[PDB]
Design a protein around this motif. Structure first.
Motif, PDB file in Angstrom:
ATOM      1  N   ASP B  23       0.820  -1.208   0.000  1.00 28.51           N
ATOM      2  CA  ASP B  23       0.000   0.000   0.000  1.00 28.51           C
ATOM      3  C   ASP B  23       0.853   1.257   0.000  1.00 28.51           C
ATOM      4  O   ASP B  23       0.598   2.190   0.761  1.00 28.51           O
ATOM      5  CB  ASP B  23      -0.944  -0.004   1.193  1.00 28.51           C
ATOM      6  N   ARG B  32       0.615   3.387  11.531  1.00 29.10           N
ATOM      7  CA  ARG B  32       0.220   2.153  12.187  1.00 29.10           C
ATOM      8  C   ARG B  32      -1.242   2.219  12.599  1.00 29.10           C
ATOM      9  O   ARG B  32      -1.730   3.251  13.061  1.00 29.10           O
ATOM     10  CB  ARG B  32       1.110   1.881  13.392  1.00 29.10           C
ATOM     11  N   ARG B  33      -1.943   1.106  12.416  1.00 26.69           N
ATOM     12  CA  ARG B  33      -3.401   1.095  12.479  1.00 26.69           C
ATOM     13  C   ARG B  33      -3.856   0.633  13.854  1.00 26.69           C
ATOM     14  O   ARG B  33      -4.526  -0.381  13.999  1.00 26.69           O
ATOM     15  CB  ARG B  33      -3.961   0.212  11.376  1.00 26.69           C
ATOM     16  N   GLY B  34      -3.522   1.402  14.878  1.00 27.97           N
ATOM     17  CA  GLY B  34      -3.992   1.077  16.210  1.00 27.97           C
ATOM     18  C   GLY B  34      -4.296   2.319  17.011  1.00 27.97           C
ATOM     19  O   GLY B  34      -4.916   3.246  16.492  1.00 27.97           O
ATOM     20  N   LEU B  35      -3.872   2.350  18.270  1.00 27.01           N
ATOM     21  CA  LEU B  35      -3.984   3.560  19.070  1.00 27.01           C
ATOM     22  C   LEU B  35      -3.091   4.652  18.505  1.00 27.01           C
ATOM     23  O   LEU B  35      -1.928   4.413  18.175  1.00 27.01           O
ATOM     24  CB  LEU B  35      -3.587   3.293  20.519  1.00 27.01           C
ATOM     25  N   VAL B  36      -3.639   5.851  18.385  1.00 32.10           N
ATOM     26  CA  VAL B  36      -2.849   6.990  17.952  1.00 32.10           C
ATOM     27  C   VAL B  36      -2.930   8.094  18.995  1.00 32.10           C
ATOM     28  O   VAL B  36      -2.055   8.207  19.854  1.00 32.10           O
ATOM     29  CB  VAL B  36      -3.299   7.488  16.572  1.00 32.10           C
TER      30      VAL B  36
END
Lengths: 785, 36, 73
Positions: B23, B32-36
């Motif tokens: 991608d 990163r696809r979590g907590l931000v």
RNA sequence: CGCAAGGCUGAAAAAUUGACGGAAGGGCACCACCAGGGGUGGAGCCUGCG
RNA sequence: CUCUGUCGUGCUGAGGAAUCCCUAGUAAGCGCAAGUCAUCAGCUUGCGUUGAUUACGUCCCUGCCCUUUGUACACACCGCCCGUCGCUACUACCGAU
């Protein structure tokens, strides 16, 4: 291809390492050998020297209740026990990582405490030859040890630590100096007091008396201060009378008397010595009314002082068998029987065959010495610019000549015919002295560091400060050629017996070999880890090896090289300091090497795992219940005698052991292991699950493996009989544990709801206006698609 | 050939194709696809 | 360490009344370590532990079922 | 055409990020285990490789 | 290959230690055709035909790769892996100049 071996070593009384002992003998430390002198007559009694060890010795201790056994602590971390009856090492102890620095013995002498610079103190048994245990405190190095059982130590982090020995952990600590370092420890022989000497010249004084409550043993009763503000090396108590001696590494030793702490302790006397004392020691002689204070200096001497108790006199001294500061040059005779060594302050000439000194002169500084042929007179070029001349057979000073004004004679070479000498100095010139009358001078560009002649007296070679070598002709001083290519200035040179080779030792850590026809470098060979001081050929090719040469460097090494095949043939170790000078014999059979060491030398299943742990715990349970029945019958001595694995793991319960062996395995392996467990092993597991639920610990793990056990054996349990009894026990215990834990957590969550509602009621709002818009957590939660 | 291999390994330059992110177009920063 | 934290928290709540723990005012209460967020964190983790122990009790009635079957035999 | 195109010379480091391991736990393999099958290797012919 | 008859073990003998390969239209048998700018007639490559036994599990042996940092958040689970040195910063020590 004959190698070299150490045969002789001499010129040394006590080194700069610590810890002198008295026995009327003085037992001191030369570098790797511990040697014992008489103080009355200067002849040494003995030397203790081990072929397996090379490291230097730096701590000595006399065993109490049995002299003629001694403990020495070396630099590599080893300890040896010597005898004075027979000079062997009976036991050796290799326990520490680095640098034993303080020894101590028990009162009974069966136990030995050694504290290192790697900060471990290790206590040693002397009838089983096993490292007993390892006491571990002390941010950095331990500077004092004593046996009070109890141990009292002090370290360089300025902490006194009072250790126990029955239970190997520290009972007390105190901090002696606030922002400094506690440097020395002195204990009274009756254990009433201890004084610790710190960095500022302050002596702190502590009183000793002879676990769940406040234990208080050491009490800072007061501080004292001495006269000199140096790092104090030692504090030594009198074993019989009421005195002690405090000294740092300086020229004064302060003896104080025992009668506020300033009223208790007053300086009896301050003893000045001629050199910096490294270690003082006490001596009591039978039949004298005095104090025999035995100091051992850094400047290579022993002194026995008499102190009158209720002034100092330099009573005895040992200085004849050693140079007193540092040997800078050696020059050995044409008959190779005697040699001369030239040191700062002195000339001392020695016999090779007896390794005992014969003559002594005093000079100011001694850069270069060489005798004139016939070995009647010697030549010394000094730092102040002059050239002194002495003679052996009448032991006197003949002549002195201001060769250069204030410029050190860096090089002296006698002519191979033997009628002239050449002195190259720290001025630009180099002068020729015919015998002495000045014949010809040579003005050159820079300071001449080293010059040498040719064995057939044909060509001369000076070696400048400009990192270059000028090879001249001997008859008229015309420039034959010059050798270049040295990054740093040339320290020494030696040219071959037929004048077809020059080796040239520089400060850029290599030596060069030149051919001396056309002066082509044969091979530049990088061979030392530091700046190579000196080089020397063996002069005789009578033995077939005249193109071999030695090279001595600041990295404590001599190296024997072959210039014909360009190869190092031997590496000579054995020196513990930067070797300043060396010389070879005219026969070439031996060589002398004089160092910074001050010692001149002469060289010639997971399931099976948990199942066996279940069986171990089951045998432990049977032994413990039998011991319970015995102690219920009578309080007589009954040992449980459990497994050595349990008494090595530390007398843990069998419940704790089997819990750890169930906890260690990952959960998938736990599932497979409990599946692989058989039904002979199941009832022991069920008893231990009862034990876990009774003494509640890991209740989720207990319930997990319990429900797995019941579900994978449900038919066999409901067909068996004894599982009824033990399963009823585990049901009652597990239900009590679960109800207790659940009711506690329910009380907690109800209380947290109540206090949260009360805190909201406190928080709500004070003011009331038209805008109630004043009255939440938020998380971010990125996601890629 | 052996000296060529030793030179590339020492001053290491290798011509392997490298694993690129699938991608890289739509998500060029690589968050990163979590907590931000 | 959840059981030892729950037990000494139980002792703390049984020792001190609710009004003191609600009117608790300490100078280090700013941001994430203030009293609201501290009690919220404690409460939500205790909710998770309580849900675990409730599932364990409901699954633990299997031992009473097995003892009932052995009583039948 | 101009520069490159003048020999202290004479063959064989980086690092707060580095060097090497061990123990535990996984995944895979007809260069592994397990069950079998088949070659080559014995006689003769000959390409090829040494 | 299938079926039907005539004769009957008769210099008229299926490969040791090792070592290698192989799990389904695979091993093995069989013929027919082509000769494609390199290779290949002492053979090569296609193409059809007949077509099994035994594994298809496990990391126990031999190994290979990787986790002990990252790369996502709910349930749920785990719970500070270990050693020998380097490098850096500071502290004091040792002894020559």
């Amino acid at each position: 291809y004959l190698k070299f071996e150490p045969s002789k070593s001499f010129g040394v009384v006590v080194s700069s390492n610590s810890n002198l002992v008295w026995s009327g003998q003085a037992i001191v430390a030369a570098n790797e050998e511990v040697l014992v002198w008489d103080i009355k007559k200067g002849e040494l009694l003995s030397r203790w020297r081990d072929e397996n060890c090379k490291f230097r010795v730096t701590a000595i201790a006399q065993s109490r209740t049995d002299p003629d056994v001694f403990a020495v602590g070396y630099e590599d971390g080893s300890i040896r026990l010597w005898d004075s009856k027979i000079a062997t090492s009976v036991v050796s102890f290799n326990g520490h990582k680095s640098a034993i620095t303080v020894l101590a013995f028990d009162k009974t002498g069966v136990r030995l405490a050694s504290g290192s610079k790697d900060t471990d103190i290790i206590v040693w048994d002397l009838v089983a030859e096993v490292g007993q245990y390892k006491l571990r405190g002390h941010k950095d190095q331990v500077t004092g040890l004593y046996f009070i059982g109890f141990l009292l130590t002090t370290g360089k982090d300025s902490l006194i630590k009072l250790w126990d020995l029955s239970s190997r952990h520290c009972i007390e600590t105190h901090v002696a100096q606030a922002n400094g370092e506690c440097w020395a420890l002195g204990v009274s022989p009756d254990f009433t007091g201890c004084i610790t000497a710190g960095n500022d010249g302050e002596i702190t004084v502590w009183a000793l008396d002879a676990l769940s409550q406040s234990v208080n043993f050491l009490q800072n009763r007061g501080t004292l201060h001495r006269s000199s503000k140096e790092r104090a090396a030692e504090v030594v108590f009198h074993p019989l009378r009421d005195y002690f001696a405090v000294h740092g590494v300086e020229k004064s030793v302060e003896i104080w008397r025992i009668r506020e702490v300033s009223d208790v302790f007053v300086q009896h006397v301050i003893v000045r010595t001629t050199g910096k004392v490294r270690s003082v020691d006490w001596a009591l002689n039978p039949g004298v009314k005095d104090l025999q204070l035995l100091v051992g200096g850094t400047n290579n001497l022993l002194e026995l002082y008499n102190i009158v108790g209720k002034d100092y006199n330099k009573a005895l001294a040992v200085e004849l068998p050693g140079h007193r500061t540092d040997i800078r040059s050696v020059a050995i005779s044409s008959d190779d029987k005697m040699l001369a060594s030239a040191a700062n302050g002195s000339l001392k000439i020695w016999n090779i065959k007896t390794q005992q000194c014969i003559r002594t002169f005093d000079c100011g500084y001694a850069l270069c010495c060489a005798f004139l042929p016939g070995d009647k007179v010697v030549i010394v070029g000094t730092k102040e610019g002059e050239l002194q001349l002495y003679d052996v057979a009448s032991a006197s000073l003949l002549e002195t000549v201001n060769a250069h004004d204030g410029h050190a004679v860096w090089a002296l070479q006698v002519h191979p015919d033997g009628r002239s000498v050449v002195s190259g100095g720290a001025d630009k010139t180099a002068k020729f002295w015919d015998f002495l009358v000045q014949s010809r001078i040579l003005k050159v560009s820079d300071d001449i560091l080293s010059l040498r002649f040719s064995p057939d007296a044909r060509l001369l070679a000076v070696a400048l400060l400009d990192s270059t070598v000028k090879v001249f002709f001997n008859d008229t001083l015309k420039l034959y050629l010059n050798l270049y290519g040295h990054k740093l200035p040339v320290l020494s040179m030696d040219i071959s017996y037929d004048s077809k080779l020059i080796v040239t030792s520089s400060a850029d850590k290599n030596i060069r070999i030149w051919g001396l026809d056309f002066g082509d470098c044969h091979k530049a060979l990088f061979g030392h880890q530091d700046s190579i001081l000196q080089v020397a050929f063996i002069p005789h090719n009578s033995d077939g090896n005249g193109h071999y040469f030695f090279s001595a460097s600041k990295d404590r090494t001599i190296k024997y090289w072959d210039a014909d095949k360009f190869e190092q043939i031997q590496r000579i170790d054995g020196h513990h300091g930067e070797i300043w000078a060396l010389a070879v014999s005219h026969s070439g059979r031996f060589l002398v090497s004089a160092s910074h060491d001050k010692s001149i030398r002469v060289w010639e299943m997971a399931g099976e795992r948990i199942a066996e742990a279940l069986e171990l715990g089951m045998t432990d349970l049977n032994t413990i219940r039998e011991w319970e029945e015995a102690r219920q019958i009578n309080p007589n001595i009954a040992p449980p005698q459990r497994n050595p694995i349990f008494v090595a793991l530390g007398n843990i319960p069998a419940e704790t052991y089997v819990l750890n062996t169930l906890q260690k395995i990952k959960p998938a392996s736990l599932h497979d292991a409990l599946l692989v467990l058989p039904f002979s092993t199941i009832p022991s597991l069920l008893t231990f699950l009862n034990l876990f639920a009774q003494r509640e610990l890991n209740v989720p793990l207990t319930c997990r493996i319990l429900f797995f056990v019941l579900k994978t054996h449900h038919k066999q349990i409901v067909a068996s009989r004894t599982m009824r009894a033990t399963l009823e026990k585990v049901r009652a215990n597990l239900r009590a544990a679960l109800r207790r834990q659940k009711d506690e957590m329910g009380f907690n969550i109800a209380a947290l709801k109540v206090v949260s509602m009360q805190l909201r009621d406190k928080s709500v709002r004070e003011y009331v206006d038209e805008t109630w818009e004043e009255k939440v957590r938020k998380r971010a939660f990125a996601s890629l698609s | 050939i052996e000296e060529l291999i030793k030179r590339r390994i020492l001053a290491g330059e290798f011509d392997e194709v490298l694993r690129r992110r699938p991608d890289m177009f739509g998500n060029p920063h690589g968050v990163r696809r979590g907590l931000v | 360490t959840a059981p030892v934290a729950q037990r000494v928290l139980w002792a703390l709540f049984k020792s001190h009344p609710a009004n003191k723990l609600s009117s608790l005012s300490v100078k280090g209460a700013r941001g994430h370590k203030s009293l609201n967020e501290v009690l919220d964190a404690i409460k939500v983790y205790t909710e998770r532990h309580y849900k675990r122990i409730e599932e364990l009790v409901d699954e633990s009635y299997l031992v009473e079922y097995t003892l009932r079957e052995m009583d039948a035999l």
